[PDB]
Amino acid sequence: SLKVVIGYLALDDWEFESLFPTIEWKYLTHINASFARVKADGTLNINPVRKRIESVRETAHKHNVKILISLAKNSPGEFTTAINDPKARKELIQQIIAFTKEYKLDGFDIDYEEYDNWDKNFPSLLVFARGLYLAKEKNMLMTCAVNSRWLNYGTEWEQYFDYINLMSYDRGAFTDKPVQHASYDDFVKDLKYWNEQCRASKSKIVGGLPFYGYSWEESLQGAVDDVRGIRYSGILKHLGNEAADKDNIGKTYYNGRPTIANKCKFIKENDYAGVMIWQLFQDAHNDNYDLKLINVVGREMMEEGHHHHHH
Numbered sequence: 001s002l003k004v005v006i007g008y009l010a011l012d013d014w015e016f017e018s019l020f021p022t023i024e025w026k027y028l029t030h031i032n033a034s035f036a037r038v039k040a041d042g043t044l045n046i047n048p049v050r051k052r053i054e055s056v057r058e059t060a061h062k063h064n065v066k067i068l069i070s071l072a073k074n075s076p077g078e079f080t081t082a083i084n085d086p087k088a089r090k091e092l093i094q095q096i097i098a099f100t101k102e103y104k105l106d107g108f109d110i111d112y113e114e115y116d117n118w119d120k121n122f123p124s125l126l127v128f129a130r131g132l133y134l135a136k137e138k139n140m141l142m143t144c145a146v147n148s149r150w151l152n153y154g155t156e157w158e159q160y161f162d163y164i165n166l167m168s169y170d171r172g173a174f175t176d177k178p179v180q181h182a183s184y185d186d187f188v189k190d191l192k193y194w195n196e197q198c199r200a201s202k203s204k205i206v207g208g209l210p211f212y213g214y215s216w217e218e219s220l221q222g223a224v225d226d227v228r229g230i231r232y233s234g235i236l237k238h239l240g241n242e243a244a245d246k247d248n249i250g251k252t253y254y255n256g257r258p259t260i261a262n263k264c265k266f267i268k269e270n271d272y273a274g275v276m277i278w279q280l281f282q283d284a285h286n287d288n289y290d291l292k293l294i295n296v297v298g299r300e301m302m303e304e305g306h307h308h309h310h311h
């Protein structure tokens with residue numbers, strides 16, 4: 001089966017202008033334009049993507065990369081409210097299909113993360129999934145960003161998606177207490193979980209990879225964001241190039257090149273669909289080109305090899 005590399009791209013990222021011209025398209029098969037936000041009434045807040053979606057699509061397509069619009073809650077409870085209301089649900093489904101057609105995208109990605117009353121709300125989420133699947137075009141791609149092991153998705157869910165992107169990161173990282181938010185062991189167990197418990201064929205299961213981490217270091221308390229999150233580019237900037245080949249330095253935990261490489265290796269060695277990346281823009285800049293994580297994924301998943309013309 002064909003391997004994939006699905007990269008998330010935040011279209012309203014502060015570093016967009018500067019970094020967009022550097023996207024390594026040869027190492028990507030799909031990109032998820034980051035978030036048209038779902039509103040309580042089923043309508044979409046497309047402010048984070050409206051200004052660049054068309055331009056991103058033209059570029060992606062020029063490099064034969066598929067582009068999907070990723071959807072997530074506008075604010076807590078809004079995505080749930082939308083799917084729990086019949087008319088708002090039908091409106092939402094029409095908006096997604098319409099946005100996808102209007103901007104000539106290849107599909108859409110569902111990133112539903114309303115954890116309040118998860119089990120109670122799942123039947124309505126399924127009703128939503130079934131609907132989108134029925135309303136979408138046959139050729140339109142339909143993917144989803146999912147959690148593993150800690151939340152049930154049942155065994156029906158899987159069949160409606162071309163690719164299931166496992167968010168194997170942020171594990172136990174929102175308290176004091178430094179932790180590795182994306183360990184190798186958790187990555188492997190998450191993959192197993194979807195194949196053995198959610199009964200999803202390995203052929204559509206894709207392992208998520210983080211191009212960022214967290215730091216509980218006192219010296220970086222202002223460099224990290226809202227939740228102590230820090231980009232790989234930030235990690236190299238403050239911790240030095242030596243950080244590129246480790247998953248931890250002091251109280252800063254992330255995924256260095258060896259681990260990213262090893263996760264990619266596991267994917268290939270066990271015939272999974274491929275890998276996914278949360279935020280391509282978080283990667284190192286060209287000042288550290290050789291230490292870029294996308295190049296590690298590229299060397300593992302999209303290695304051209306030695307070839308010649310006139311075969």
Ligand SMILES: N[C@@H]1[C@@H](O)[C@H](O)[C@@H](CO)O[C@H]1O
Nearest residue numbers: 304305306307308309310311
């Ligand atoms: N014709 C091939 C190219 O397609 C390939 O990209 C290049 C890589 O070095 O080798 C050439 O022989």
